[PDB]
Homo-oligomer: A and B are copies of this chain.
């Protein structure tokens, strides 16, 4: 079948595309290359440079299923104008849903985020917890979810919403690991929250496993958390990154959720999926990957 992957030129998207290609799917990538790169696009995938903010972004693009992973990266949320978060998330997602409805797309796999929970009262956070986002980005993802669920109930466009915790691995050009490497690259002698980290390989496997199970279900909409079972502190990451680079710098402490960890009991019970690496191991591996890419 034909699979459309928005944001397929980005971090998670490019890795998702690679696995879909390995599985034999005909993959169509749609990306405006704002944060993604052509070098990350699998040679077997068909790239279409379009901007999801445009209502007619999908003109001439056909697919049976769409993995909507396009959006501005989830980082430095307080430094980006609210309108940007709104347009790149809420408007883009609505345009994807309208395209899906009008073209007869049967399934929408929406890349959501733990930010929809904001500062959750329960951690690990179960899917049952309500929307309490503290950032515009988180509100935008939550709004995207509401619209997706409605299109599923009203137009039959089924949707699996994947609420990702922190995902890390090769090709990553944003996030705490990236920032630390670039800082040490600036000054290896000096280096200026507890969250769950999942290696991109595990994240992609979990996502595809959930999608398969979802396609074997009849529920119009389903939200599922995707992340590791443990978590690591900022200072731990800083330590790991330094060791990988063989450095011993001085740590200098100079709407962002402080603590985050999603409960993945539903995912594991539904698919039998299990993480292959702990948060600390995923961070270490990623640092080694990015070292060859950035150092």
Chain A residues with CB under 8 Å of chain B are 55, 82-83, 86, 90-91, 94, 98, 101, 118, 130-136, 138-139, 142-143, 146-147, 149-151, 153-154, 255
Contact = CB atoms under 8 A, between A and B. Distances in A.
Contact of A146 (B98, B133, B150, B153): B133
The 3 closest A-B pairs by CB, nearest first: A139-B150, A143-B143, A142-B146
Given A136-B150, A150-B135, A98 B118 contact: no
Contacts of A83: 55, 94, 98
> How many copies, total?
2
25 contacts: A82-B94, A82-B101, A83-B98, A90-B90, A90-B94, A90-B143, A118-B153, A130-B130, A131-B146, A132-B149, A133-B146, A133-B150, A134-B153, A134-B154, A135-B154, A136-B150, A136-B154, A138-B150, A139-B147, A139-B149, A139-B151, A142-B146, A143-B143, A143-B147, A154-B255
Nearest to A135: B154
Given A131-B146, A143-B146, 13 more contacts: A83-B98, A90-B94, A91-B91, A118-B153, A133-B150, A134-B150, A134-B154, A138-B150, A139-B146, A139-B147, A139-B149, A139-B151, A143-B143
Contacts of A86: 94
Nearest to A136: B150
Contacts of A131: 146
Contacts of A90: 90, 94, 143
A86 B98 CA distance: 11
Most buried by B among A134, A143, A255: A143
